[PDB]
Write a protein that holds these residues in place. Structure first.
Motif, PDB file in Angstrom:
ATOM      1  N   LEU A  56       0.821  -1.205   0.000  1.00  0.00           N
ATOM      2  CA  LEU A  56       0.000   0.000   0.000  1.00  0.00           C
ATOM      3  C   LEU A  56       0.858   1.259   0.000  1.00  0.00           C
ATOM      4  N   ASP A  57       2.025   1.214   0.643  1.00  0.00           N
ATOM      5  CA  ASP A  57       2.897   2.378   0.703  1.00  0.00           C
ATOM      6  C   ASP A  57       3.653   2.610  -0.596  1.00  0.00           C
ATOM      7  N   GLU A  58       3.819   1.574  -1.416  1.00  0.00           N
ATOM      8  CA  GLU A  58       4.527   1.691  -2.683  1.00  0.00           C
ATOM      9  C   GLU A  58       3.598   1.966  -3.851  1.00  0.00           C
ATOM     10  N   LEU A  59       2.349   1.514  -3.771  1.00  0.00           N
ATOM     11  CA  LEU A  59       1.404   1.674  -4.865  1.00  0.00           C
ATOM     12  C   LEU A  59       0.640   2.989  -4.793  1.00  0.00           C
ATOM     13  N   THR A  71      10.376  10.721   2.230  1.00  0.00           N
ATOM     14  CA  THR A  71      10.184  10.388   3.638  1.00  0.00           C
ATOM     15  C   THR A  71       9.644  11.581   4.415  1.00  0.00           C
ATOM     16  N   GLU A  72      10.182  12.774   4.158  1.00  0.00           N
ATOM     17  CA  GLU A  72       9.727  13.960   4.874  1.00  0.00           C
ATOM     18  C   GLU A  72       8.291  14.303   4.503  1.00  0.00           C
ATOM     19  N   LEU A  73       7.963  14.233   3.211  1.00  0.00           N
ATOM     20  CA  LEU A  73       6.605  14.536   2.775  1.00  0.00           C
ATOM     21  C   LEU A  73       5.597  13.612   3.448  1.00  0.00           C
ATOM     22  N   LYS A  74       5.917  12.319   3.525  1.00  0.00           N
ATOM     23  CA  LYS A  74       5.000  11.369   4.144  1.00  0.00           C
ATOM     24  C   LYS A  74       4.732  11.734   5.599  1.00  0.00           C
ATOM     25  N   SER A  75       5.778  12.114   6.336  1.00  0.00           N
ATOM     26  CA  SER A  75       5.596  12.496   7.732  1.00  0.00           C
ATOM     27  C   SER A  75       4.786  13.781   7.851  1.00  0.00           C
ATOM     28  N   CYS A  76       5.042  14.752   6.971  1.00  0.00           N
ATOM     29  CA  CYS A  76       4.302  16.009   7.022  1.00  0.00           C
ATOM     30  C   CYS A  76       2.818  15.779   6.771  1.00  0.00           C
ATOM     31  N   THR A  77       2.490  14.903   5.824  1.00  0.00           N
ATOM     32  CA  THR A  77       1.120  14.693   5.377  1.00  0.00           C
ATOM     33  C   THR A  77       0.466  13.458   5.984  1.00  0.00           C
ATOM     34  N   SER A  78       1.163  12.733   6.862  1.00  0.00           N
ATOM     35  CA  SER A  78       0.649  11.455   7.352  1.00  0.00           C
ATOM     36  C   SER A  78      -0.767  11.587   7.903  1.00  0.00           C
ATOM     37  N   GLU A  79      -0.999  12.569   8.770  1.00  0.00           N
ATOM     38  CA  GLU A  79      -2.298  12.744   9.413  1.00  0.00           C
ATOM     39  C   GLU A  79      -3.179  13.768   8.713  1.00  0.00           C
ATOM     40  N   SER A  80      -2.613  14.901   8.305  1.00  0.00           N
ATOM     41  CA  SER A  80      -3.334  15.924   7.561  1.00  0.00           C
ATOM     42  C   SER A  80      -2.521  16.273   6.326  1.00  0.00           C
ATOM     43  N   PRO A 129      -1.548  20.408  -8.107  1.00  0.00           N
ATOM     44  CA  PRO A 129      -1.207  19.223  -7.307  1.00  0.00           C
ATOM     45  C   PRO A 129      -1.577  19.414  -5.842  1.00  0.00           C
ATOM     46  N   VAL A 130      -2.115  18.360  -5.236  1.00  0.00           N
ATOM     47  CA  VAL A 130      -2.518  18.396  -3.831  1.00  0.00           C
ATOM     48  C   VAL A 130      -1.862  17.240  -3.080  1.00  0.00           C
ATOM     49  N   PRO A 131      -1.403  17.441  -1.844  1.00  0.00           N
ATOM     50  CA  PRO A 131      -0.883  16.313  -1.063  1.00  0.00           C
ATOM     51  C   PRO A 131      -1.996  15.413  -0.548  1.00  0.00           C
ATOM     52  N   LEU A 132      -1.641  14.154  -0.300  1.00  0.00           N
ATOM     53  CA  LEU A 132      -2.570  13.141   0.184  1.00  0.00           C
ATOM     54  C   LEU A 132      -2.115  12.616   1.538  1.00  0.00           C
ATOM     55  N   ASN A 133      -3.067  12.420   2.448  1.00  0.00           N
ATOM     56  CA  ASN A 133      -2.759  11.807   3.729  1.00  0.00           C
ATOM     57  C   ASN A 133      -2.740  10.283   3.598  1.00  0.00           C
ATOM     58  N   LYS A 134      -2.299   9.617   4.668  1.00  0.00           N
ATOM     59  CA  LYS A 134      -2.136   8.167   4.610  1.00  0.00           C
ATOM     60  C   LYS A 134      -3.468   7.446   4.446  1.00  0.00           C
ATOM     61  N   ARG A 135      -4.536   7.950   5.069  1.00  0.00           N
ATOM     62  CA  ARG A 135      -5.837   7.310   4.909  1.00  0.00           C
ATOM     63  C   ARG A 135      -6.358   7.485   3.488  1.00  0.00           C
ATOM     64  N   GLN A 136      -6.106   8.645   2.883  1.00  0.00           N
ATOM     65  CA  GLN A 136      -6.517   8.870   1.503  1.00  0.00           C
ATOM     66  C   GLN A 136      -5.644   8.082   0.538  1.00  0.00           C
ATOM     67  N   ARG A 137      -4.360   7.926   0.868  1.00  0.00           N
ATOM     68  CA  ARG A 137      -3.465   7.148   0.020  1.00  0.00           C
ATOM     69  C   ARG A 137      -3.875   5.682  -0.018  1.00  0.00           C
ATOM     70  N   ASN A 138      -4.260   5.123   1.132  1.00  0.00           N
ATOM     71  CA  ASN A 138      -4.644   3.717   1.177  1.00  0.00           C
ATOM     72  C   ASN A 138      -5.914   3.453   0.383  1.00  0.00           C
ATOM     73  N   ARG A 139      -6.858   4.395   0.383  1.00  0.00           N
ATOM     74  CA  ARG A 139      -8.081   4.208  -0.388  1.00  0.00           C
ATOM     75  C   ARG A 139      -7.779   4.101  -1.876  1.00  0.00           C
ATOM     76  N   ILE A 140      -6.913   4.979  -2.388  1.00  0.00           N
ATOM     77  CA  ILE A 140      -6.583   4.945  -3.808  1.00  0.00           C
ATOM     78  C   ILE A 140      -5.918   3.623  -4.165  1.00  0.00           C
ATOM     79  N   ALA A 141      -4.982   3.167  -3.331  1.00  0.00           N
ATOM     80  CA  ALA A 141      -4.269   1.932  -3.634  1.00  0.00           C
ATOM     81  C   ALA A 141      -5.163   0.711  -3.474  1.00  0.00           C
TER      82      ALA A 141
END
Ligand SMILES: [Mg+2]
Ligand SMILES: [Mg+2]
Lengths: 92, 98, 151, 101, 25, 92
Positions: B8-11, F53-62, B31-43
């Motif tokens: 999930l972290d690679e896809l 790695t830094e981007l993931k930590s910055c955006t992990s929760e929001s 471009p917009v950043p994605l959070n981990k919960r949003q990233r997992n949904r896409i994958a």
């Protein structure tokens, strides 16, 4: 002769107008921004628009008086804001 | 479980371009950043779509096979991620940063 | 003693008015044997090299690209006309010498021409452009303008 | 990165005294705000006592008070007295008519 | 001076990163 | 000598649209750098590992990171509080 051939470089740029920029081959959009700054610091766009239609001398004088008042009024406003900020900084 | 989280972290794409209807003129693709919960949904949706192309009648079997192939490197959803990241690299200047 | 007409540079002139955009591409031709003529004074030689003759090569307006009436003075008409010019300069093998861009007025096509030359449409021409200038004509008093329109 | 923009670092002159505040960003911002061409007077001929009308045949000095296109600068920018601004503008207009500026 | 130079280090780094991104435009 | 401009008596001292500085999001700039890193060294290049790695930590929760996403100006509060004291008005 060659005397009139080797003295044309300065001569060419000796009769400059002041509305020209030497383009920066790296960032060519920065030279167009520099040219725009010259136009606005010489009021070229404003003058051109103001010359499209004739205005009566009395109206011209009225507009010049009002514009000056607004310019001076803004300078008086900014002076008072600076006093406020300084007074706030010192706890007044 | 560790295999699932790694896949999930690679896809999942790190960022995704979204159209914002800002102004009466054409919307902007920023471009917009994605959070981990949003990233997992896409994958996960990509995995499910890939899984449902397999032959087994049981969704668990198809899902298991798909997850095994992804853990072994082979997946057709990595192309989707590369195409979402290409678009974002193109629109890097459209970002606002304030 | 012999006409030796040669191109020294190109002038890309743009006139951006309220109702149209005119783009002219010209060549600054120099007879390289002018100084070899007889009965030529130092002043005549310097005066000939200070204002070299110009020849028009490409002349375009927004109506040459099919924009009609009110559409001629819009931003999109100028951008496409600028592209057609940048293309015709490459299709005529006139991108060998340096180009000097001269902009005339401040209509809606002035910012379209600049965008088309600092963008993909003018990535070939921009590399040759050496000098940008403004040639807006202002009057110090001069003739009386028409009366203000009451609208 | 081992580099900082000059606009983000203050270079303390030699022989001067400093406070800890001089290393802060507030000093940088404060120096920009209060950055005025006050050293012009000592380099400004027209703010020295000379009559600007005596320079009507010296375009180089007069060209310091006009813009790139030759537009005489407003008194708000030149900082001259009313009399010197009045005299300087006359000098420039006379210089233009003679064929020197 | 250290207390001031520490806050200055953070801001410099932050403002040398906004410039890099903003200039990228 | 610098000309001071003094305002007439005013019904108020107010800034119409006070300029507030808004700091940039650290996640957005991190994303802007990573996107550039991929533009030069290529997408997924090992050189952009730290950025990822830094981007993931910055955006992990929001996705825009936790931030003090509020700031208001107080100039108008102080300007109205101090105007009567500092305007230099003559006594009644
Ligand atoms: Mg129209
Ligand atoms: Mg008529």
């Amino acid at each position: 002769a060659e005397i009139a051939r080797s003295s044309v470089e300065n001569a060419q740029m000796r009769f400059n107008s002041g509305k020209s920029i030497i383009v920066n081959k790296n960032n060519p959009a920065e030279s167009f921004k520099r040219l725009n700054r010259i136009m606005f610091e010489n009021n070229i766009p404003g003058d051109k628009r103001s010359q499209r239609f004739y205005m009566k001398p009395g109206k011209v004088a009225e507009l010049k008086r009002s514009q000056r008042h607004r310019k001076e009024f803004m300078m008086g406003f900014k002076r008072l804001i600076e006093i406020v900020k300084d007074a706030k900084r010192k706890g007044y | 479980i560790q295999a699932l989280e790694k896949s999930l972290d690679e896809l999942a794409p790190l960022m995704m371009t979204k159209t914002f209807n800002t102004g009466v003129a054409k919307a902007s693709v920023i471009p917009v950043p994605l959070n981990k919960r949003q990233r997992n949904r896409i994958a996960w949706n990509w995995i499910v779509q890939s899984a449902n192309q397999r032959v087994s009648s049981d969704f668990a079997v198809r899902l298991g096979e798909e997850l095994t192939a992804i853990a072994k490197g082979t997946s057709s959803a990595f192309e989707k991620r590369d195409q979402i990241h290409k678009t974002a690299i193109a629109h890097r200047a459209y970002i606002q940063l304030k | 003693y012999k006409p030796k007409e040669e191109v020294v540079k190109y002038i890309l002139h743009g006139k951006f008015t309220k109702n149209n955009t005119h783009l002219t591409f010209s060549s600054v031709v120099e007879d390289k044997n002018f100084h070899k003529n007889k009965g030529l004074t130092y002043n005549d030689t310097m005066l000939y090299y200070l204002n070299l003759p110009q020849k028009v090569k490409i002349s375009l307006s927004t109506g040459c690209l099919g924009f009609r009436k009110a559409a001629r003075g819009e931003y999109e008409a100028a951008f496409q006309t600028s592209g057609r010019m940048f293309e015709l300069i490459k299709e005529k093998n006139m991108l060998n010498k340096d180009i000097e861009v001269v902009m005339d007025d401040f209509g809606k096509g002035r910012a379209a021409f600049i965008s088309a030359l600092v963008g993909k449409e003018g990535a070939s021409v921009v590399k040759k452009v050496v000098k940008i200038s403004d040639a807006t004509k202002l009057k110090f008093g001069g003739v009386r303008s028409p009366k203000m329109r009451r609208l | 990165t081992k580099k900082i923009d000059q606009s983000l670092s203050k270079k303390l002159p030699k022989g001067t005294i400093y406070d800890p505040f001089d290393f802060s960003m507030g000093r940088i911002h404060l120096d920009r705000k209060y950055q005025a061409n006050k050293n012009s007077n000592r380099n400004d001929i027209m703010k020295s006592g000379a009559n600007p009308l005596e320079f009507y045949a010296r375009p180089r000095i007069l060209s310091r008070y006009v813009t790139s296109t030759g537009r005489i600068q407003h008194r708000d920018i030149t900082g001259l007295s009313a009399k010197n601004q009045r005299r300087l503008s006359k000098a420039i207009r006379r210089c233009q008519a003679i064929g020197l500026m | 001076e250290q207390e001031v130079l520490d806050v200055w280090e953070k801001k410099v780094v932050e403002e040398t990163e906004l410039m890099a991104a903003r200039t990228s435009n | 000598k610098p000309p001071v401009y003094r305002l007439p008596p005013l019904p108020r001292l107010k800034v119409k649209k006070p300029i507030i500085r808004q700091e940039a999001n650290k996640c957005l700039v991190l994303m802007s750098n990573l996107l550039q890193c991929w533009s030069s060294y290529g997408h997924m290049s090992p050189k952009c590992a730290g950025l990822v790695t830094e981007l993931k930590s910055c955006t992990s929760e929001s996705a825009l990171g936790k931030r003090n996403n509020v700031q208001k100006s107080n100039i108008n509060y102080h300007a109205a509080r101090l105007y009567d004291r500092i305007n230099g008005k003559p006594h009644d």
